[PDB]
From Swiss-Prot, chains A, B, D, E, F:
Protein EC: 3.3.2.10
GO molecular function per UniProt: epoxide hydrolase activity
Functional note: Involved in catabolic degradation of epoxides. Shows highest activity towards C6 and C7 carbocyclic epoxides. Also active towards linear 1,2-epoxyalkanes.
InterPro entries in UniProt: AB_hydrolase_1 (IPR000073), AB_hydrolase_fold (IPR029058), Epox_hydrolase-like (IPR000639), Epoxide_hydrolase (IPR016292)
Residues forming the catalytic site: 97, 207, 262
Ranges in coiled-coil conformation: none
Domain of life: Bacteria
Protein name: Soluble epoxide hydrolase
Enzyme class per UniProt: hydrolase
The species this protein was found in: Corynebacterium sp. (strain C12)
Length: 284, 284, 283, 284, 284, 284, 283
């Protein structure tokens, strides 16, 4: 059940991923501003019953950092190339934050490949082409407009002080139940990977495609998933995300985790462990 | 026919203002990230026929900078208090950018005081309580979410490098027809005033009240102005702003200034001079 | 008199300046510059020619896409500009990477560009398959810095743009004289290269320069037939005729005496004089 | 097994070196941007059967930092003076990175001193005078042109943030199989020594000379070594470096270390340990 | 009428001072955070009629910067040694800010030497031992507690950004009627001299001694001056400072300069010029 | 043998000191750039047989930082007042670096108070008034001229980066046999106390008096000590300092500590313990 | 009027200016300066002479090797430059370290330098085997800071060159007046000293100044026979006649009233008047 670091050449760049365990494969997809590291307290328990695969998605963590392909459908093709490279034609998938949107396209574009889908604190995308943002949603997630608005200006302002900027998400009360989810060591690891030249540039592209090409993909994604889907959000961030996933999927269970913010794998790792072992058991 | 620097005790703080010329009074109201200085190529023409009053609005320029009262209703009471201070009971008003919204409330709350109103590249408020931002508009003005979402965090990232940030607005092709509206000496003036401790914090309170109390105040402003209004946007920013002003005013004319960006008083001063002289001539 | 203009080109806002009237001349700048490098040549050309000097993709005050920095794609931008302005015939002047873009602008639009003037540049850095002599790799060691790992180069340059640009603008290995540029001038280049995206975009010029550009130049085997002149500084590339002779049938030029890489600024009068005579038959 | 810290006066500067164990002496020679410290996980195992000697080469680690003599032949005289000072007339050598080039001149210039030579992820020199860098090779090792090209300018760009710069090498997927070969403590040790004034200057001179004097010395070094050589590269950096070493040595063995980058001593210490003990066994 | 720069060794340090003109000597004593430069628009007009002598006081401007002797009694002895050096046994004095407090000790301690005293916008000392600060006074001059409370801590915080801090006094509406009394080239001159190592340390010792030995001295300074004293404050700072001076002088005239802040010599030079020429007229 | 932290009001400032143990009192005097903390590995053993007293001398460590009194005669009067406040009329003293010079004046000025004197790697002063510096000596201690020449300018250049500057002394092969005498935690403690405002200013004053007042004091200090003295230097710094102490003391023993630099207490704490326990035994 | 030039000199590009015509005079600057310190002197001398004012090894805009910073070797650079311009006979003015370079230039080329004008310098800092009295070591404490551990001094200086240079440029112990330099003149010296290698190189001037140069000055026993004038500022080195009499047989000079160290900049008319008289026999 020990984690090994690996790389492979995926769609012209070096993708870092970790593996643990044996048996049926579960792919864990992190979000912004994180890395496979955000699953470190989940992987060992899952690795007793599953093969666990946790990549650093295009641009983030220790993965190399292309200049394009940050729309979530293109990033989903990296996950596909990775899974097929490891020799698997069937997988379960957990996706948190942007990883849940990548997870959505990964399942939507590969109905032969994804058998079960577990989302944590994410909606299938930010918005569909032609829809509007209610003022309170805009305020609750203002950062999408700063990151994705003029991404080179965001990158400059963030890269000046990554240690300060990441704490807007990692320690504040509007993102977490407890301001103490993350040790200073854990925050230092996220500051290390977001400080690698290109990580901030890549991350603002995640948001910038998120308000452009991704919105056009979401409006055209009307063919509901037929696989089992569970969607759990944190009481103290997106709350009950089950209805949102009900819109792109026939079979959706879930709700909100009590006294839990956005970073569900790190604030309530035992919730994710237990929920996942039960949700994926029929696949072992 | 030459500008003079003045100050006055206004609603508990020291407010900076420049006066010039004589005859019927015009009150010129700057926006963000500027000061009375944006009117410097306008004032000397208006001053041949008019008394010209151009203050530093609350928190910005060389004005003092309280900790609240940044909704445009409250700042308009500042303009009321000053005009009362200077002996005037009837005035003309030009408002650019947020000056525009301050001017809207100044006219709305004092029906006997503001006789005519000239707006540049602004709408009466960003949005009304209950409404939503189309993606295109959210992207065009993404800064409003950065400044207004978590003001303290935005103040921190902007304050690290005012010289860099201000240029997002002052020299870019999405804000200006020409990237050369501002000499380095002009930019250095607006960096000086915005580098005064409290100027950035106050500036972000402008956007923060912008998306909270200001939106409530606009949903309740349905008693339309009866006074003549003109409203000129720049071709290369807000364009034909007449319809936005017809929602809150019975008697609106104007349109788009051609090959002109957001900073109409500095990119096309002659346009502002000729319009103003003709629009306010009836009040001499 | 120079007028500032913008146009929506290939999905971004392109800044360009115009002056004068009559036959159109396009002046294409290089790294780390902008239209501003032609500021002391334009008024003299403006007397006899329409002059159009754009900020190429990502540099100067132009908008800064994330892709399309290979020189063929930056040539399509110039085609779109020239078409936007109403012209179906142009003269072109290209300095540094502006020369390489010029080259592709001519190569891909045989019935649009009538005459080509290259300053201190070769068609591209190298063809795919070829290798760098050690002395050459040491002379232009910066291409590997900017183009090798562009994010890393972007990080290291951006901490001090005022310092890094002086590697090129005041040194004796790029200039006959270390006083070609006023402090006001360096400050303009610092200003545009400190706009978020300008450095990132610049490193993309070099990255594509060592990758896709090398493939496009290896296949660029159909020689230009239009008149070409190629002049390099004595104290940089010097006599660049042999290099252009490989992509062009009709090549004149050579080396400017006591002149470094930045010929438009070090020797404004040479460029004015050479261009009025070269472009004369097009009025 | 205890590592001890020493210094000797060597060719006019103070050289830091560490020692461990007892028996026949093995000299371990580090490369850029490291120090004796890259051997820390190999020394104790070697020290059970050998005397282990690991200096900080001229200008790097904690050694003093002259302004000249950074060509690899001069630096090998330093290693000769150290071995002589310690009283030994026969040694084995392991050289990693630039320490492999210094090892090469140490063996070439002292044919009765050095009995066996183990090379890790290096070639005898970057290139021979009169030869050309293929475009893929120039891109792979593009840092040599940056350091060596205009050393004062590289020195300034690097010294501005040593902690950022060294991670280009220490945590990247193109230099390492895993992005996790180095703890934050290990990188801080390399940042410490390379933050000592003179270290970045000295390191740039290793490369400057690497592309000048060293290229001419390599072309003239036409006498193949007669002593046993093993040369092992990482699968994910130089790979099978036997042919490169077959040009300068008559008896060469080795290959590629599986799923190993450039930093073989730290990424596969057990591989270096097992290989050294078997290769140097006949000298005990 | 031309300013010349000089230096003289005074009480064991190099004192900088400027001279112009001929006739009866007037000595001009600057305050904080300034230098002889604050008198630059007064000196030429005073020099048509008088010898003008304007030194950099101890530690400030380009004068050298001892570690002790910042009490105003001691700094008055430097001015005595300077008037001695230049060979005058009768002078008039103008003293602004702390220069006024020095000028007081200069007259008090040398009664045959100082014939007439002109104070600008100062009181003889911040306070007498035994007395207490009203809350209004404490808030109005809070900087005195900063500088003089823990001078090393004030020194470190101010010195981090001298350009930012000086503007607390030079451009603000509580120090100045107009926020434009100083150009950028003028604020640059004050940032230049206060960035000379030792200028901020010296400055804080002006304040530290101002709240300690100066208070003991002022309590025991009870034999009032017999010489004619005029004291003028700015209407927007100290105002009518006659009562404060009537305490320590028998023959006081003066009052308040209309629409003038603290810096009377740069904001209302002509007032200083006409008040001076009239007040010292009986000395030619 | 637990160390306890204390303070006393000594000659007008708050002096930090630690104590430990019981019986006859030994006073340990640190040098530059250090504090009581250099004694931390010696105190516990000496505390089994003695009362151990280790002060932070004027301006350094956590002691307060007056602006004067940094000549070593004056700093020795602080130690007299401390020993007198603690109620002792007989003491032994150990002094290292500048502590040794302070110890010298303490014994020289208090012939009946100090019974025995242990010097570590110091000479009684830098130089006697009227003597000259050979070129090699000036180069070996070049920093005294940096610190003491123009202390404000050195304070400015050192205070920009204290972490970097202290390493000139703490990790360098010319000050230390080993570059690893100090952990990062130890260096951090020295950086912490020398990053207190006043500390660097005070340190520079030690050197400034060191080349001024102290040279006049030392020329006049011709009445040799009569009490037992032992003086031990590092093999790799001052070596056998007996002859230097025999010029000011009749009864001197000591020599050089093998493979030891300047920081004897931290590089060879056991030598200091063993030597102090034998030397001070007769006083128990 | 002043022309910026360069030449390959002993393996590096040396920047130099020239002006005027007739007999050549060579002007050698000191630390922390450049050809620039002569700019109020050059105009008046260019009415009667050719003026040549190089940037010495590693300072100003000249290129910056790692070695050869001893004043005998820096004098070989000056000999190579003079001979590139084809003069068999020169007059020389040296200020500060330029004075010591001038000394070895004169000492090592007995038929090249006809006449020598020293401003506020001594032949070297000190002779090997000699010692610094305490007040001397304090007055020039900077030589030990720059020359002791050069790498350490470079790090501390280079963190803020604008602050450090003011130790020399605006202080009452280096200058009668604190206003000898405009902000624009200080910015010029900050610019050249902010080029990477400038501070490293300057520190090597002092490092060699307290080592090889002390050995070389001890072995410089053959007094010069050519006319030497030596003038210090009243408020720095004062009457430097005696110091130059130890190494030259024919020395005149003294002290300039109310003048610090930077005589070329605080008393240009004094340097002009003195140069024109002294070198007049050489027209």
């Amino acid at each position: 059940t020990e984690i090994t670091h690996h790389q492979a050449m995926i769609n012209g760049y070096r993708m870092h991923y970790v593996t643990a365990g044996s048996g049926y494969p579960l792919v864990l997809l992190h979000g912004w501003p994180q890395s496979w590291y955000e699953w470190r307290n989940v992987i060992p328990a899952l690795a007793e019953q599953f093969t666990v695969i946790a990549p650093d998605l295009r641009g983030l963590g220790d993965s190399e950092k292309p200049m394009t392909g940050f729309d979530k459908r293109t990033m989903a093709t990296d996950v596909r190339e990775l899974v097929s490279h490891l020799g698997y034609d069937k997988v379960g998938v957990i996706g948190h934050d942007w990883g849940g949107s990548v997870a959505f396209y990964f399942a939507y574009d590969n109905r032969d490949l994804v058998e079960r889908l577990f989302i944590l604190d994410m909606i299938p995308g930010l918005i569909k082409a032609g829809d509007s943002f209610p003022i309170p949603v805009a305020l609750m997630i203002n950062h999408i407009f700063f990151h994705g608005g003029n991404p080179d200006w965001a990158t400059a302002l963030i890269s000046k002080d990554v240690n300060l900027y990441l704490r807007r998400f990692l320690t504040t009360l509007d993102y977490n139940y407890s301001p103490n989810v993350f040790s200073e060591e854990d925050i230092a690891e996220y500051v290390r990977v977001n400080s690698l030249p290109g990580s901030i540039r890549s991350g603002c592209q995640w948001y910038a495609t998120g308000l452009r090409e991704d919105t056009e993909n979401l409006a055209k994604a009307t063919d509901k998933l037929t696989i089992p889907v569970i969607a759990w959000g944190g009481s103290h961030f997106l709350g009950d995300i089950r209805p949102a996933w009900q819109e792109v999927a026939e079979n959706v269970e879930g709700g909100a985790v009590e006294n839990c913010g956005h970073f569900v794998p790190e604030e309530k790792p035992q919730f994710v462990i237990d929920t996942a072992l039960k949700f994926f058991a029929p696949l072992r």
